[PDB]
Structure 1
Amino acid sequence: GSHMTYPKYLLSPETIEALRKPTFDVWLWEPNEMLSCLEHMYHDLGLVRDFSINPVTLRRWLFCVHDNYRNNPFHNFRHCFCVAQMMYSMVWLCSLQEKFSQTDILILMTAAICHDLDHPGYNNTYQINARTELAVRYNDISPLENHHCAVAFQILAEPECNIFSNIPPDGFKQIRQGMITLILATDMARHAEIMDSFKEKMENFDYSNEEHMTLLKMILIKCCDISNEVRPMEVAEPWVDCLLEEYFMQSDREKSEGLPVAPFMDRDKVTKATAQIGFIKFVLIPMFETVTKLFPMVEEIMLQPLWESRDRYEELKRIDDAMKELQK
């Protein structure tokens, strides 16, 4: 509709609009444009307003978070943009602003954005088995996540990046604590435990009970973190090739170094379709199914796509198997 042309990092009104939905094409955007989006989220959600974030600091902070992600095939800045943007979608799709405080929203967002800071592209199993410095340092306890978290607060400690610089120390402490819980919650080692906790509370969920809410926030950050297959098929599908890229880098290394190899990461045994059929069926669907009990609109917007994806990979699998049978 626009009478002249703008720079990319001036998001158009349509981009700003699209950004509220999970249909958003995360791939269309370069890092600056992504950084502008994350910026707008913080303003749009009323977090700049309500926590007096100096708006140039918001930017420096974002820029600096971005510098601290690595160029991993999957665990990179675009990943965090996805996780952050899915949280944003969900604040709208589940009207989280009715249920949550702005302090909770600020934690969900800053945790989302930071939750994979300085990821090395090899998981906790590698760290632990290779007895890496991180694994030694964190006593084999959620080493990566504890690391992301530390880098998170090291950035915020720099005064030019400190988006919380104008929050009272009580609020800071409250934000810090949420952020830590949430970022450690993203360790998939704890998935069944966290899911069981949540389901127990879900027997009689209570929005005024802090414990209930911490479990809900943990499920929300977990949803956004592994949510790629909720996105449109053209947007989701390239991620899987990236994740397999990293997964294979590790299992090569693991073979060469004489360490155990996850069959789910073993080049020789994972294929895409088999990888995702199981993840969608037994991790993603069930998780969003229980979310839907609190937020029924989540079914239409996020279970449906997951069903379609499950069903397509089932189709693709039927065809791989035929063909891999002609390799023999």
Structure 2
Amino acid sequence: LLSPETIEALRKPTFDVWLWEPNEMLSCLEHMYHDLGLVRDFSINPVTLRRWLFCVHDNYRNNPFHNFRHCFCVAQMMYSMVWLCSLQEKFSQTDILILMTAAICHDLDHPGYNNTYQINARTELAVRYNDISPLENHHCAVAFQILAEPECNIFSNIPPDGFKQIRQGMITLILATDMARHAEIMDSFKEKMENFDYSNEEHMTLLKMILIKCCDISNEVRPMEVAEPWVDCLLEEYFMQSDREKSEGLPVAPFMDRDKVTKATAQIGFIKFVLIPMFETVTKLFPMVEEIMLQPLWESRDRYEELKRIDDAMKELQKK
């Protein structure tokens, strides 16, 4: 079970995600589906929603980063943003359901090695998906294989028109999380920012893509306390790949290269050039984003630059 202080904390991006066992996390997710009115408006069976949440959990691998606690971080951050940006005045319940279900499903069965590995290694997945966002395409297929199982089918009581619309929105959102598309998806968005229209379908579809993109990579929005161990987990996984890429002679990405990668320099760039501009142009629609998220991103960038100068000092002392 869960406290009423927990249930309140669950709505802000300061929620401490490392406090909870999987069981308590499935209840937090379940609760979001009730509290957002999704159960009510789409006639979701309350036991089918529990089943489905457990159905999702099992299909998540035990990876250092891309695991079931990661998708909880993303789902819980999406939830946080519904309240902080009043999205229930700007979006239909269907769009909310798509945003929260895609956020829960967008890394199903991640294997721990990114698209570049998949392709360069000519994996089954790269071969099945023709080098085209193989992981993200795999994530959707799993999410809908899960929903094709009737007792995991939280959509059982939605009419087929509604299903098709939800399934199409989920596919877009999950496929939009492929970071190779970041500059493209960002450019389309800001272009529409010169005159953003809530009644333009393309515009809403682009705002949702950015919204799930924001949640996916929002660990440094959380308090330094919560954010910091995530970078550790990320580098683990990343070194796990680059080690493989060399027992294999495959190219090695500099940001996974043990010889060139510190915790400071893994974040300093990523905050400055990816996380801040993204939340900036998002703040242009929700000013109250500036205080609650764009702020921890400035203090995070500033801490990690300090850490880099200490790290470098220490790197004089070895390398002889």
Q: TM-score range by the shorter chain?
A: over 0.9
Alignment deviations for residues 203-256 of structure 1 (CA, whole Å, 9 cap, x no partner): 100000000000000000000000000000010000000000000000000011
CA distance in 2: counterparts of 1:55 and 1:324, whole angstroms: 56
Alignment deviations for residues 153-209 of structure 1 (CA, whole Å, 9 cap, x no partner): 000000000000000000000000000000000000000000000001111000000
Alignment deviations for residues 121-168 of structure 1 (CA, whole Å, 9 cap, x no partner): 000000000000000000000000000000000000000000000000
Paired residue for 1:112, among 103, 108, 117?
Answer: 103
Identity of aligned residues (%): 100
CA shift, 1:78, in A, is 0.2
CA distance in 2: counterparts of 1:172 and 1:250, whole angstroms: 37
Paired residue for 2:214, among 209, 223, 247?
Answer: 223
CA distance in 1: counterparts of 2:273 and 2:182, whole angstroms: 12
CA distance in 2: counterparts of 1:112 and 1:16, whole angstroms: 19
CA distance in 1: counterparts of 2:315 and 2:176, whole angstroms: 38
CA distance in 2: counterparts of 1:325 and 1:92, whole angstroms: 48
Count of residues in Structure 1 that have an aligned counterpart in Structure 2:
319
Per the normalisation by structure 2, the TM-score is: 0.99
Paired residue for 1:186, among 169, 174, 177?
Answer: 177
Alignment deviations for residues 65-124 of structure 1 (CA, whole Å, 9 cap, x no partner): 000000000000000000000000000000000000000000000000000000000000
CA shift, 1:325, in A, is 1.4
CA distance in 1: counterparts of 2:316 and 2:185, whole angstroms: 40
Alignment deviations for residues 254-283 of structure 1 (CA, whole Å, 9 cap, x no partner): 011010000111010010101100000000
CA distance in 2: counterparts of 1:313 and 1:256, whole angstroms: 32
CA distance in 2: counterparts of 1:88 and 1:190, whole angstroms: 24
Question: Displaced runs of 4+ in structure 1, greater than 4 A?
Answer: none
Q: Which residue of 1 aligns with 2:140?
A: 149
CA shift, 1:43, in A, is 0.1
Query: Secondary structure of 1:23's match?
Result: coil
CA shift, 1:302, in A, is 0.2
CA distance in 1: counterparts of 2:317 and 2:275, whole angstroms: 32
CA shift, 1:326, in A, is 0.8
Query: Secondary structure of 1:296's match?
Result: coil
Gaps of 5+ in 1: 1-9
CA shift, 1:324, in A, is 1.4
